[PDB]
Amino acid sequence: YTMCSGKFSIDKEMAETQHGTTVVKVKYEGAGAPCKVPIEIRDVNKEKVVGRIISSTPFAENTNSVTNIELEPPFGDSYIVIGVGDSALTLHWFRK
Amino acid sequence: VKLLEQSGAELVKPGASVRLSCTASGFNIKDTYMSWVKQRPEQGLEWIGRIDPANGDTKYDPKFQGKATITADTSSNTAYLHLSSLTSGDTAVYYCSRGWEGFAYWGQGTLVTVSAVMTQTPASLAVSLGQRATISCRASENVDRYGNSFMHWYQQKAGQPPKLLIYRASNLESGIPARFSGSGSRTDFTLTINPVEADDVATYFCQRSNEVPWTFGGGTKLEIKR
């Protein structure tokens, strides 16, 4: 299997757990599934890779199923980037 | 495709109560938002409310509070709509739907017969074949969440459920021709159809979903210039 080439959408509000982590529920829109979900957290400038992804190698099984991704953004402003290139879903997050 | 299976038509007397069902397949409802939408004959789409089946949290449009009760059973992967003290005003097609960034999935609709701000412009328009058509949506407040505009566009052809065209203001839904495009940020949004084709004759609706209520615009009927 390879990285998903297509776009992603979010099925529910991003939920902050009691363990200082965030859970994202994603739906794949593109082709080539099953494929690996490209997901990373970037700084305020949308440059350097920050925080971490908790879930092991998240996969999009098809274009109907929902992929549950647990991640840990750093404190303050960050950007959760789901997918590849300019088609990628960018989600602004602020951790208190 | 058709992942949402709705219960059959209801024909009741006033004062009755009904419980409509929506069974999902190909996904677990726990991981989604399940909404119900009302449509009176020849009228616009009205968001009733939504359930988060994971915790049973429900939110309703102020108009439907006291009339509608949405429930969910994660074990049978079914969402329900309870309507109490039914009146002729409740006669409508009721749709169940899945999604937050627009409703990509709709049920077939359930007809319930009781035998007794989002500003969209224009109300209707006509354009010649091959020409550009533009439909506008103005929200009374900003519709951003996580730096993204939660503004969506739908097409609804006569006697059919609506279908998602554009989600998150400018993203083209899979299976939708590239002649459909969305633009805008802040409070003003536009759906562009260019070039217009004969098969584009339908009613178009905008919808916001950043915060509850997930209000639909009043709709715009598109016709071809005679």
Side-chain angles (χ1 to χ4, degrees):
Chain A
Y1 308 99
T2 52
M3 302 309 290
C4 294
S5 64
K7 293 165 104 171
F8 288 86
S9 60
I10 189 173
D11 260 287
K12 312 178 88 154
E13 280 188 335
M14 282 187 286
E16 185 145 48
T17 73
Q18 294 191 66
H19 294 86
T21 69
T22 301
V23 168
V24 197
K25 302 222 161 63
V26 304
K27 183 214 164 303
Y28 186 48
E29 307 286 359
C35 56
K36 300 173 278 177
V37 179
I39 191 160
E40 65 181 69
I41 310 153
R42 293 187 192 181
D43 66 342
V44 205
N45 304 34
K46 294 185 194 186
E47 296 176 343
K48 68 164 185 177
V49 178
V50 292
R52 64 187 179 120
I53 313 302
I54 279 134
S55 298
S56 70
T57 313
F59 254 91
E61 297 303 323
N62 52 63
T63 61
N64 296 314
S65 61
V66 179
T67 305
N68 303 343
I69 312 169
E70 193 176 346
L71 48 95
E72 194 182 272
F75 293 104
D77 299 287
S78 74
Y79 293 89
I80 300 144
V81 187
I82 316 166
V84 294
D86 294 334
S87 62
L89 162 68
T90 301
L91 300 160
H92 176 75
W93 188 260
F94 182 77
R95 184 184 180 184
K96 289 178 183 181
Chain B
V1 207
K2 47 190 87 174
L3 299 191
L4 305 175
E5 185 216 322
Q6 288 190 239
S7 55
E10 298 278 0
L11 183 58
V12 300
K13 279 292 194 101
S17 285
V18 293
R19 189 195 69 176
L20 313 179
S21 70
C22 176
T23 309
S25 54
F27 69 93
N28 301 318
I29 67 161
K30 191 187 178 174
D31 302 324
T32 72
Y33 286 143
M34 295 303 296
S35 286
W36 287 90
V37 177
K38 183 189 183 181
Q39 187 169 45
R40 298 266 297 146
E42 308 310 308
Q43 293 192 63
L45 298 168
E46 303 179 79
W47 182 79
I48 296 167
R50 73 101 186 93
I51 188 160
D52 177 343
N55 61 10
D57 180 283
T58 60
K59 293 293 169 287
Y60 301 91
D61 182 274
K63 181 183 179 163
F64 297 100
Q65 287 169 18
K67 172 60 63 178
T69 302
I70 301 160
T71 59
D73 183 6
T74 57
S75 293
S76 71
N77 220 39
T78 308
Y80 302 95
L81 176 64
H82 182 269
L83 304 167
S84 61
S85 300
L86 292 159
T87 67
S88 57
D90 302 310
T91 295
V93 170
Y94 291 85
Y95 297 99
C96 69
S97 60
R98 168 207 161 176
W100 188 31
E101 296 202 282
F103 300 162
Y105 306 90
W106 293 77
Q108 65 274 32
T110 299
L111 180 63
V112 175
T113 306
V114 190
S115 313
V117 335
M118 290 281 283
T119 303
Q120 198 178 326
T121 190
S124 67
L125 82 168
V127 296
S128 293
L129 283 184
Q131 293 288 91
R132 175 178 67 110
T134 64
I135 297 166
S136 299
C137 196
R138 179 172 289 174
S140 59
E141 279 170 7
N142 163 87
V143 299
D144 288 354
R145 275 302 286 275
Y146 322 121
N148 303 298
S149 294
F150 277 58
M151 184 59 62
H152 329 289
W153 294 96
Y154 302 88
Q155 179 191 68
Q156 186 180 32
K157 284 192 146 285
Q160 308 309 322
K163 81 166 176 187
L164 186 64
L165 299 169
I166 305 292
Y167 67 97
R168 198 193 308 133
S170 59
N171 301 275
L172 189 66
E173 181 64 4
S174 66
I176 307 300
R179 69 178 184 269
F180 290 90
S181 65
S183 61
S185 57
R186 296 172 280 169
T187 56
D188 291 288
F189 301 87
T190 307
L191 173 68
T192 301
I193 311 165
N194 194 25
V196 166
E197 298 289 339
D199 199 71
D200 301 335
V201 164
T203 303
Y204 296 86
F205 297 91
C206 62
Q207 190 205 16
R208 74 119 193 195
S209 72
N210 64 302
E211 297 296 334
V212 295
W214 303 341
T215 315
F216 289 94
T220 300
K221 190 163 193 170
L222 173 63
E223 295 152 337
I224 306 306
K225 187 201 185 134
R226 284 186 172 193

